[PDB]
C-alpha cells in the first residue's frame, strides 16, 4: 500500500 | 547443460580474444589473455610479438611443457624465433639445437645447418677487411664452411656459401 502511495509520486509525475 | 556463469564466461572470453587478434588490442589481449588463463597458446605467443611493452619468453615456457614421449608443433616454432631474433651469445643456441636433435632423432637438422651459415657470413666480411692478416680467421671460416656443407648434404644454398667464401 505504502509503495503504491509513493508511486506524492503521482503528483511529482504530473508536475514533470 | 552449460554452466551458469563459468561456461558462458569462458566462451565469451574466447570470442573476445579472437576479436582482439583480428584487431590488435595490445590492451585487450593483455587483459583478455589474463582472464582466459582461468594445449594452445599461439595467440598468446602472437600477442607478445604483435604488441610489445622482448616477446621471446612465453614461447620457451610453452616449448618446455609436455616433452616426455609431424614432430612437435610447440617446438619447431621456438627454434625459428631464435635465429630471427639473433638476426647475446649464439654458440649457445647452436648447442641447444644440437641437444634437441640428439634427443629426437622439417628436420631441425636443416634449421641447425642454416644457423651456422649466418655466423659464417659475419665471419666472411670481418675477415675480408684489412683493419691485413694471412691465416687464423680464414682457416676458421673454411672449416665452418665445410661443416655447414656436410649437414646440408645429409643448390641455391650451396651457391651462396661459395660466394661468401670468395669474398672473405
Amino acid at each position: 500500500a505504502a509503495a503504491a502511495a509513493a508511486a506524492a509520486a503521482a503528483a511529482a509525475a504530473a508536475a514533470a | 547443460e552449460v554452466r551458469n556463469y563459468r561456461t558462458r564466461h569462458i566462451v565469451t572470453l574466447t570470442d573476445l580474444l579472437h576479436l582482439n587478434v583480428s584487431r590488435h588490442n595490445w590492451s585487450l589481449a593483455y587483459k583478455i589473455f589474463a582472464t582466459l588463463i582461468r594445449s594452445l597458446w599461439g595467440i598468446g605467443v602472437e600477442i607478445l610479438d604483435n604488441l610489445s611493452n622482448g616477446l621471446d619468453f612465453l614461447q620457451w615456457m610453452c616449448q618446455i611443457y609436455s616433452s616426455k614421449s609431424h614432430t612437435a608443433k610447440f617446438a619447431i616454432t621456438y627454434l625459428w624465433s631464435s635465429l630471427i631474433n639473433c638476426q647475446t651469445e649464439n654458440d649457445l643456441l647452436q648447442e641447444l639445437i644440437d641437444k634437441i636433435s640428439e634427443w629426437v632423432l622439417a628436420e631441425v637438422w636443416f634449421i641447425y645447418a642454416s644457423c651456422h651459415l649466418l655466423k659464417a657470413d659475419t665471419l666472411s666480411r670481418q675477415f675480408v677487411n684489412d683493419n691485413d692478416i694471412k691465416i687464423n680467421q680464414v682457416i676458421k671460416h673454411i672449416h665452418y664452411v665445410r661443416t655447414f656443407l656436410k649437414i646440408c648434404l645429409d643448390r641455391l644454398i650451396e651457391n651462396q656459401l661459395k660466394s661468401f667464401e670468395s669474398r672473405l
Partner: protein
C-alpha cells in the same frame, strides 16, 4: 560423512550457504532484523523435511532453495525486490566432511546463488515494481498511474498458475502495448611449476575485466512503431528477469482473455 553421516554433512554444507546470505545481506546495509527473520524460516522448513521420519533426505537447485527463502523473507518484510533482482545479486573455512561427502549431494550443495524452474520452486513453498518498470518504460508517470489503475481494476473485475508477479508483469505489458597492472606470462609459468609440484574458483577480477572490455567497444507508421517498441520490451524483459518467452507470452495471452471476458 557416511550414509547417515553423509546426510549430516550435506545439511552442514547447506547451513554454510545460509552464511552466504549473512555475507550478502551485511554487505547490503539492510535490516539486521533480517538475520532474525532468516533464522526463523530455516528452522521451520528444514526441520520439517527432516521430521518425516529418517526417509529420503532432500535435494534442490540447492542454490534456489536458499534464494527462495531469502526472497520470501523480503516479501514479508516489505523490502522491494524481485526474483529477477535476485538473479543480479548472484552474478556478483570449509569443513572436511564437505570434502568427504556423497558425490551427488556435494554437487547439489554446490556454489553460486532453465527459465521455468526458479519461478516454480518459490510458488510451491505494487509500489515496489513501479520505479524499475517506469524507468525501462521511460514514462514520467502517466504510464505508471494508468497501469496502476488497470491492474487494480483487473483484480476487482477479476480477469485474474503463474504468480501475481507474473500476472502483474503481463498486465503492464498489455496496458502499455495499447496506450491510446598485469601479471603477464610470468603468472602462467608459476602456475605450471606449482602443478608439477602438488597443488591444493571464481573471483570478481573477472567482473571488472568484462566491464572494461564492454566499455572499450567490447560486448500504420505510428502503429507499427508502437508494436515494435512493445515487442522489444518483451524480449528484453525476459532476459533481464532471467526468465523466458514461452512463459511470458502465454501468461499475457491468458490475462488478456480474462479481462475481455470480464468487460463483456
Amino acid at each position: 560423512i557416511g550414509h547417515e553421516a553423509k546426510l549430516l554433512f550435506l545439511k552442514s554444507f547447506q547451513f554454510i550457504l545460509k552464511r552466504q546470505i549473512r555475507w550478502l545481506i551485511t554487505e547490503m546495509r539492510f535490516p539486521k532484523e533480517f538475520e532474525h527473520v532468516a533464522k526463523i524460516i530455516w528452522l521451520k522448513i528444514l526441520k520439517t523435511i527432516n521430521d518425516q521420519p529418517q526417509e529420503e533426505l532432500k535435494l534442490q537447485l540447492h542454490m534456489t532453495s536458499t534464494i527462495s527463502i531469502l526472497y520470501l523473507a523480503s516479501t514479508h518484510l516489505s523490502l522491494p525486490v524481485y526474483t529477477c533482482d535476485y538473479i543480479k545479486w548472484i552474478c556478483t573455512p570449509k569443513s572436511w566432511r564437505i570434502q568427504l561427502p556423497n558425490y551427488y549431494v556435494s554437487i547439489l550443495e554446490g556454489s553460486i546463488s532453465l527459465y521455468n524452474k526458479i519461478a516454480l520452486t518459490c510458488g510451491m513453498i505494487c509500489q515496489g515494481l513501479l520505479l524499475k518498470l517506469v524507468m525501462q518504460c521511460a514514462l514520467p508517470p502517466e504510464f505508471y498511474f494508468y497501469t496502476k489503475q488497470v491492474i487494480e481494476f483487473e483484480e476487482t473485475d477479476i480477469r485474474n498458475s503463474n504468480h501475481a508477479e507474473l500476472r502483474v508483469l503481463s498486465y503492464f505489458m498489455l496496458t502499455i502495448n495499447w496506450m491510446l597492472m598485469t601479471i603477464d606470462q610470468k603468472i602462467a609459468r608459476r602456475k605450471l611449476y606449482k602443478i608439477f609440484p602438488l597443488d591444493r574458483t571464481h573471483q570478481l577480477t573477472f567482473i571488472e575485466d568484462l566491464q572494461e572490455r564492454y566499455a572499450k567497444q567490447t560486448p500504420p507508421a505510428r502503429k507499427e512503431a508502437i508494436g515494435r517498441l512493445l515487442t522489444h520490451i518483451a524480449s528484453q524483459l525476459l532476459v533481464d528477469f532471467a526468465i523466458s518467452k514461452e512463459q511470458l507470452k502465454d501468461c499475457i495471452s491468458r490475462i488478456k482473455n480474462a479481462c475481455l471476458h470480464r468487460m463483456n
